[model samples]
Target: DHYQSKIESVYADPPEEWRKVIGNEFWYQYGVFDEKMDPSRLPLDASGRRHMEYQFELAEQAGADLSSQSIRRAIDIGCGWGPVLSFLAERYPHCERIDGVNVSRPQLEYASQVISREGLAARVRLYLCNAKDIGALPDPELPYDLAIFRGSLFHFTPQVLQETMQSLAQRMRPGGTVVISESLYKVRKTPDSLHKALEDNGFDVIDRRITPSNEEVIRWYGLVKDNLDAHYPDSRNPNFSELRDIAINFSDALRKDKASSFSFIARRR
Candidate 1:
């Protein structure tokens, strides 16, 4: 589990204050996926342009018709900074309304500002709530027509995911769909485990999408090595390209991440 801890420590170590601003819709429209830069600092580049484009294509393939009148109310779980939320809002302006729920107050604040600035405050609502507590959200009476588990199940333990699914299932009306996308690959423990829980909770496996691993992730450090070396190339800096190579290479081996990874959807019964 040391590796898991590293993943947690490395990724979740975001600055305290900016965590909220990170989810601003405009923040995502810009480049915030860069290495170590907490989005608020360098907000407008397509660090994962190709990968995101691929995801949009995959979303379309998964039969998520943003134009469908049937999808009127939607909720996004772990809706970080609202990139995906923004995409959903813009894609289906007529969806009646959209809501993004997250654990971080800062992140939710950013999302709120974006929706309000877009004059979509009435159409979009950002809530400060964790996935585990979704059903108990301040107003449980507010039902969602759709719920998204966007790249979030990976952080949960199998049992937690199961319990969470059961809770989120309660928040949706019967037949409402739930999309469970994650950074986990088929080989990862989380994705398949979450899928199993969803099925056990009465979600039908109506659709699934799996993108082949983009092995390029293994070379990510190398891709930026020269640039990093130029910026902080001092050999004695303690974290040099060689050290980064060693650290990242070790991570690549353990993660077996061959490509940009994610898993797909399951619908409620």
Candidate 2:
């Protein structure tokens, strides 16, 4: 609750305020570092956005048609700040209904405003709810055609993850697709556990890839490090040290594990 309260407070402010704190290209997850990148040449705003766009492209390759009229409804689990939803709304105006579910009140608030401003409120809705409680969303256009779990699968406990996926599968169409973008090193469940959960839930893995590389991973961490060094050189801000530690620790993990981010696309069987 304390962490929730703190994040909610930060997100509740103006969008620019949160943007200022997290930086302009605000993806909550790690970016894909597929190729060599000059960390010095990469812009904080553009790099993350480009990586995000690449994920969307992978979803497309996995059979998520942005302009498919057959797709009437979709949902983004843990849709922080509405990036995925925003992309769907803009690129696939044909998708009659789009929903974003999140536990963060501030993010929901910000997403609501953005949806309204984009004139997508007619077909887009933001729900203040946990990912596991998706069924609680009112009047859902059942059998969602597309479901996304971007860097959020680890939020569920191991005991609950399978049940949660099964429950979500109940709400998806027979041919629906689930795309998960997550870190291979960070998933709380073992690979076999995650695989069994998906299989039991009537989903078949169509494609999976370790998309990021060591150079790319370090490039992103380098950006965060540079940001802190530039903006909060001597500040008492808790995140100053916290962000530094993340860069240091994550870099070590990359080197030690040869860790790369992974993307999985599954189809409802």
Candidate 3:
């Protein structure tokens, strides 16, 4: 129903050539987000920290401080390459300590390098850890001032999702804040279940946002095909024109699929 073959062709990892692309940019192997963009080299703009800032602004409107909040202790769950962790750390320089927990060792390694390279080693720490097991975190009483979940929650199944909310709540101090920014779909009709779950875990919903995707599907397909053609001028495919038509059709079908956009912030109390 989707671009299964095309996506798989791009996503497939060749055993011999895969090693070179693991953490290198330009791989474009995985989906766009999974493409290896070295966070250690690029600033958070390429790394998607501005998206978090949008969420932060919504939280600020709901009573969180734009500054002057005691965020000396903070935790970022699934903190990919230390982008959001580094963002919060820099925003609250008084936040002398920040911890990021992630599942991928390669990501953690890169994140640690970013922290070290940016001279934030004294304030930021990266851990190869899972969000679900946060309750079992070696130190449970060290409540954080803010806990963040960004672009990482959708990967969880229902049960794991519940576990994550419970763990995040337990990791924060009273009145601490938690933020979640994610892509959802209308198919997930009960998205409010997540909000209810957060509230049940002792969080008070402070703010939320939903943005509708508007880029035209045919336009996107034409752009993609044009770029590929420009770069692969010498390619000889018997079905090239037909393939392009199919690609455009796929993009058209995709437009019917609503990409649910969301930002949620809550405070522990």
Candidate 2 lDDT tens digits, 1-269: 22345444434545564474455535666665445322553455455555666766776777754447757898888888887787777767788788898777877787888788878989898888767677766665556888888777756665446655876787888878787876656434545566678888899887777655667767777877776677667855664566678678878877787455677788787
lDDT winner among the candidates? 2
Where does candidate 1 stray beyond 4 Å?
1-66, 138-142, 185-190, 216-251, 254-260
What stretches of model 2 exceed 4 Å from their correct place? 1-17, 32-42, 62-67
Candidate 3, position 35, lDDT: 39
Q: TM-score each candidate.
A: 0.66, 0.82, 0.68
Task: Summarize candidate 3's per-residue lDDT along 99-205 as a digit string, tens digits.
Answer: 88876565566667768878999988777666777787656756778888776675566666777788777777888888776555555323586787788788888
Ordered by TM-score, highest first, the candidates read 2, 3, 1
Question: Which prediction has more favorable TM-score, 1 or 3?
Answer: 3
Better of 2 and 3 by TM-score: 2
Q: Which rank order by lDDT, best down to worst? A: 2, 3, 1
Alpha-carbon local distance difference test for all models: 0.56, 0.70, 0.60
Error of 3 at 86 (Å): 1.7
